[PDB]
Amino acid sequence: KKRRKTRKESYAIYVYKVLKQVHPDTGISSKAMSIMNSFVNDVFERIAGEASRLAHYNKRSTITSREIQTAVRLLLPGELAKHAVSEGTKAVTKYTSAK
Amino acid sequence: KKRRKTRKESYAIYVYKVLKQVHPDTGISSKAMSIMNSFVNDVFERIAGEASRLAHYNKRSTITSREIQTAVRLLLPGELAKHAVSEGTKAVTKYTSAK
Amino acid sequence: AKAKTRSSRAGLQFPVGRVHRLLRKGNYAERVGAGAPVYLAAVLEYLTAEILELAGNAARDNKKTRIIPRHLQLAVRNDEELNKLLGRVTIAQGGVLPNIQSVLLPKK
Amino acid sequence: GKQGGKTRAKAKTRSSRAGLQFPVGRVHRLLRKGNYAERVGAGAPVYLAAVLEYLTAEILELAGNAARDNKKTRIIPRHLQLAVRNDEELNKLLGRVTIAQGGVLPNIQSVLLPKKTESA
Amino acid sequence: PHRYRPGTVALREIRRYQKSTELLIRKLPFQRLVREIAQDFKTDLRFQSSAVMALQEASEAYLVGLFEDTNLCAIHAKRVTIMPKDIQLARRIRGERA
Amino acid sequence: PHRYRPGTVALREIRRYQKSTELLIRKLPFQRLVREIAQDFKTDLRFQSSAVMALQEASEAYLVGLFEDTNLCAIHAKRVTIMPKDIQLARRIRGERA
Amino acid sequence: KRHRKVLRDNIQGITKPAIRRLARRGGVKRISGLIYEETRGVLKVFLENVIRDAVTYTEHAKRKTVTAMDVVYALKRQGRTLYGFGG
Amino acid sequence: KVLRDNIQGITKPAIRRLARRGGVKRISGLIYEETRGVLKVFLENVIRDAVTYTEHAKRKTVTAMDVVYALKRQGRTLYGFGG
Amino acid sequence: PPEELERKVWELARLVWQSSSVVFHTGAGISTASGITFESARPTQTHMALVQLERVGLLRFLVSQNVDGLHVRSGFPRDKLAELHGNMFVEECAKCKTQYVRDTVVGTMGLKATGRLCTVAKARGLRACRGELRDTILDWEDSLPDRDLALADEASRNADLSITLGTSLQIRPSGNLPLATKRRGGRLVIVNLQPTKHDRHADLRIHGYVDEVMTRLMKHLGLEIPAWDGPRVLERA
DNA sequence: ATCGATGTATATATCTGACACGTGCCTGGAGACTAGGGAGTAATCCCCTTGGCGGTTAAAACGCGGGGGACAGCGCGTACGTGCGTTTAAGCGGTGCTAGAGCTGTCTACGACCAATTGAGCGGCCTCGGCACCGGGATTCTGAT
DNA sequence: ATCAGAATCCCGGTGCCGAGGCCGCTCAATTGGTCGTAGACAGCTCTAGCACCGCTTAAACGCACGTACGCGCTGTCCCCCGCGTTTTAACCGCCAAGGGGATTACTCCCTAGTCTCCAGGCACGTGTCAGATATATACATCGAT
Ligand SMILES: [Zn+2]
C-alpha cells in the first residue's frame, strides 16, 4: 500500500446520479463514463475561461453569476442557451431562499 | 483641463524605437502603429496563456524561462521559433551575467 | 448544526463545492462570487441531462441497456444545438452518423 | 544598508541590463496582473520581451522593405499586410487575423487569363 | 463605335480593387443595415462611429475571403462564373453550415 | 457464376463501416509509424500503450472527416470518384494547405 | 422622426455594384445574377452572429452604446481577430 | 519484400475502409500516396507537440495526456482518455 | 567583295577609335559562332575581343540578347552588361531582389522556382531572407528585367556610337534601344548577313562574318584578342 | 414478371468478465467566524452621437444590344471494383528483465511583499515636410492608316 | 507592320494636416531587503514498457476480368457584360441639442482566509447478469433469365 493510492477525482458518481434521475433502467459503460467526464471538464474550461475574459475586459476582479450567465449566453447556441440560463437562475434563486 | 486626464499605456514608443534600429530613414503612420500595438497584445496573450497551461499540466506554480520557452516552441512555426528561442536565451544569459 | 452539501441546498446533483474549488484554484480570476459555482453546476447538470436523455433514447432504440460511445455520438450529432456546441470535438470509438449522399445511391 | 540604494546603482532598467528595447518591467507586471499563474520567475519576462521584440523587428523589417518598394518612407497598413502575407511563417502565425485598411495581395487565379504566341 | 471585349474591363476591375484598400460598400446603407439587425436584439441601441467602421471592415474582409474560396470552387467545377452552390460548398467545408 | 455489379459491394461497405465503433488501421503498423516520426524529434522515447491509441483515434477521425469533405467536392464537380485535387481543395478551403 | 425610429428594407441598400466590387477584390471574373440575394443572405447571417455577441457585451457592461471594443471582442470570440481598432 | 518502410504499413485496404466510413463510393488510385502524405503531416504536427510536452515534463515516456494536449492545441479536442 | 569589306572595317576602326561612348549590342549568332552545351561551350573570339575593347575603353556599355550567357561565362564585367532575354546561369530572389551566380546552369525557365531559398543573412539577428529564388528566363514579350532595360535604354539615350553584332533588331524593345542612340544624334552601325526591319536607319551597314570582322577590327586597333583562360566571374570591372 | 442464392436478419442456448453495489478509510467540504476592499450607486461634466437641411455631383438604376459562357448530349478509352487463391505477419499468450515513472525526504535558492526614491512614458502643443493632388509636358504605347 | 494619336506616364508645383520632437509632470519601475515554501535533487520500489519466442488464421497482397465512369468535344440558347442617359440619394458641410459615456466620492455587502469537524467520495473487493459467441433457421433483395 504505502499511500500511493493518490485519489483520482472524477464526475462519475454525478453523471450516474443524473442518468438514473432521467432514465431509471439505463446504465453506463466505463468508456462512456470517461467520455462524459471529459465533456464536463471541457465545457467547464470554456465557461470559466469566457467568464475570466468578461471579468478582465470590464476591469472586475470577481467572476459573479452575471459573468457565468453572459459566458453561457455567448457559448451555448440557440434554445439550449435559453434553457441553460433558466436552470441557472432557478438554481441561484433556490440557493438564495431563506438566505 | 479640470484635472480629468487619464493615461492609456501602449507599445508605441518601443515599436518606434525598434523601427529606427531596423530602418533609420523610415517612419510609421498612426494606423500602422495601432496595428503593431494590437499584434504585440495578441502574441503576448497567446504565449502567456500557453505558459499557464504548461505550468498547470505539470502541477507547477511558477511560469519561468522554461514554460515561456516551450510555449514559444509550441506557438511559433518554423525557424521563427528557433530564432525566438536563440534571442530569449541570449537575453536571459546576458541578464544573469554578474549575478 | 448538521452539514448540507451546497448541491442539495441548490436542488441539483452536480457538486457545487467541487466546482467552487475548481474555479478558485484554476486561476480564472482573482475572486469567485458565491453564485458563480451554483450557476455553473446547474448548467453542467443541465447539459449532461440533455446528452444523457438523448443517449439513453438512442440506446433504447438500439435495444441495449448500457450507454456506450455510439449512443453519445448519435445523441450529439442528431441534435442541431449539441452538434454546434461540440463542433470540433472527436469522441473515442463514437463512429459517424449513417448518411449517404443522394446522387451516390442507385437509380431505381 | 538601504542608503546605498538611495545613493548608488542609478536604476539600470531590466531592459537595458538584458540588452532589450522592449519593457521587461511592463511585460512582468502584465504577466502578474493577467492571472496566468500563481508565480512569475525572473527570467520569464526577460525571455518574453526578447521574443516580442524579435517578432516586431521581423514585421518592421519586412514592412519597411514593402514601403521602400512603393517609394514611400512612412509605413501604412497596406505595408504591414504585404509584409505578413508574403512571409510563410508570419502568415501562419497571423492566419486568423484581418488587418484593417490592409487589402489583399494582388492575385488572379491563372485559368482566368488569355494566352500568347511563341517562335522558340 | 468603341467597345471593350466583355470580361476585359472586369479583369481591369480585379487589378484595381486588389491594388486599392478603401471600403467598397456604401457607408450610409451599411449603417442602416447594422441598425436594423441590432434592433432585433435591443430597442434604442446607439453606435459609436468606429464601431460601425469595425463591423464594416470585418464583414467586408469576410465577404472578400469567402469570394476567394467561392472562386476556387467555381474553377474546380470547370467554370469562370461563381454561382450560389459555390458559396454553399465553401461554407459547408469551412464548417459554417455543417 | 454469380458476381455482384460494380459499386454495390462498396455501397454495402459504406452501409457497414458507418454502423461500427472499431478502428480501421492495423495496430502494430501504426505503432512503428508513430515511433519512426517521434525519433526525428527525440532519440530513445517510450510510449504509453494508451498514447498510441489516442493518436490512432484522432488520426482515423481526421482522415474520415477529410474524406467526407473530399466527397462533397467530388460530387460538386459532377464526379462519383474522389481525386487528389479534391483532397487539395478541401485542405485549401479549411486553411491547412494555404 | 427625431426619436424612436423603426427600420426595414435596408438590406437592399447593399447595392448590386457594391457586391460586384467585393467579388472583384476577391479575384472574381464573372458573377451569376442569383449571387446578390445569396450574398445578402450570407452577409445578414454573419452580421447577426457578430452583432448578437456585440450586444451581449453591451448588456454585460450595462450600457446602451455599441463600442468598437465590443465588436473587436465579438470577432475575437468567433476566431476572426481584427487589428487596427485598439484591441 | 521484407524491407518495408513504416509509412507503407498504412495499407491500401486501411485507407479504403477510412474512405468508406466517410461515405466515399469510388476512390481514385492516386488517393493512397496523397492520404499517406496527409497522415504523416498530421502525425508530425501532433507528435512534435506531444514530444515538446514530454521534454517539458523532464520524462522519456510519451503519455496519453501529451497527445490529448497536442490535439486540444490543434483545435481537435479528443474525449475518452482524460480532461 | 573582300577589299570593300576591308575598307568598311577600316572605317569602322576609325568610327570606334574616334567615338567617345561606344555601346555594343549582340545577338545569338556571335555566341553560336563556335558551332554550338551552355556549360561546355568555350566563348567565341568576338566575346573575347569585346572584353579587350572594354579593357582599352572603346566600350561604354554592353547589351546582348544571347540566352547562352557566354558574356557571363567570359567574365565580361557584369556591371557593364545587359542580357535582355535572361540567362541559363542566373536566378533572382523574389522577396528582396538580390542576385547570384552559380557553377551549374539553372535548367528551368520562365521565371519559375528553382528549389533554393536565398542566402542573405541580416543584422539584427533576424532570419536569413528565406525568399524564393526564381530563374531569369522571361518566356516571351513581358516587361524585361527592369534594371537591364532601364540601363540599356539610358545608355542608348546617352551613346554616340552603337554597334550591333550578330543582331536582328526585330525583338522589341531590345533592338529598338539602338534607335535611341540614333534619335539623340548619335551614329549607328549594323553588322549582319541576315535582313533586319530597321536596316535603312544606320550610318554604316556591313555584310560579313562577325568573328572575321571583329578579328580584323582588333588588328586595325592594333590589339591582340585574349585567348580564354578558362571561365570568368568578375562582378565588377 | 418469377426465380435462386447470397447476406443480413433473427431465434436459440451458453458461457464469461465488466459494472454495480457494498465496506472501510481519510481527505476535503462544510460550519461559524472575522476582516477589508471591490463594486454598487448616485451625482456631475461635456463629449459625440443622432437629426435635420440644402447643394452637388458621383454613384446607382434602367435600358438595349450582343457574344461568350453554362450545360446538356454523346462518344470513347482506361481505370477501379469484385473476386479468388497464395503469402505474410498481425494478433495472441506467455515469460523474462530492468528502465524509468512515481512517491517520499530533505534543503536551500528563488520570488512574493513591502517601503522609499526617481525618471521613463504619457498627454498636449506646434512646426514643417511626406505625400495626396494635380495640371502640364513627354513618351510610350494602341488605335488609325 | 507603318502612321499619327491616343492613353498613360513622369514630373514639377503647391498645399495641408498628420507625423515627430519637445516640454512637464506623475505614477510605475527600481532598489534593498526579509520570509517561507515551491521545487530540485537523491534514494528506493515495483509498474508497465520493451524484447522474444512460436503458434494460429485473419488479413493483405497480387493477379484477371469488364463495366461505368471520367472527360473531350460540340452545339444552342440566354444570360451578363459594357456603355449611354437619366435619376437618385450619398456625401459633405453646417448647425442644433441632449442622451449617455466616463470619471469621481462615498460606503457596506461580500468573499478570501481561518480552524476543526465529520461524512462524502475514492479504492478495494466480490458476485452475477447484460451482453458476446456459436449455432440454427427464416426473410430480404439483387440480378439474371
Ligand atoms: Zn532575399
Residue numbers in the entry:
A (entry chain H), B (entry chain D): 24 to 122
C (entry chain G): 12 to 119
D (entry chain C): 4 to 123
E (entry chain E), F (entry chain A): 38 to 135
G (entry chain F): 16 to 102
H (entry chain B): 20 to 102
I (entry chain L): 26 to 61, 85 to 285
Task: Give verbatim lines from the article.
Sirtuin 6 (SIRT6) is an NAD+-dependent histone H3 deacetylase that is prominently found associated with chromatin, attenuates transcriptionally active promoters and regulates DNA repair, metabolic homeostasis and lifespan.
To investigate how nucleosomes stimulate the activity of SIRT6 we prepared nucleosome with the Widom-601 positioning sequence and reconstituted its complex with full-length recombinant human SIRT6 that was overexpressed in and purified from E. coli. We find that SIRT6 is bound predominantly at the ‘right’ TA-poor arm of the Widom-601 sequence where DNA interactions with the histone octamer are looser. R175 packs against H2B L103 and serves as a classical ‘arginine anchor motif’, binding to the acidic triad of E61, D90 and E92 from H2A. SIRT6 presents two other arginines, R172, to contact E56 and Q24 of H2A as well as Q44 and E110 of H2B and R178 to contact H2A E91 and E102 from H2B. We find that three highly conserved arginines from the Rossmann fold domain (R220, R231, R248) bind the phosphate backbone at SHL 6 and 7 of the nucleosomal DNA. This alters the path of the terminus DNA by 37° and breaks DNA interactions with histones H2A, H2B, and H3.
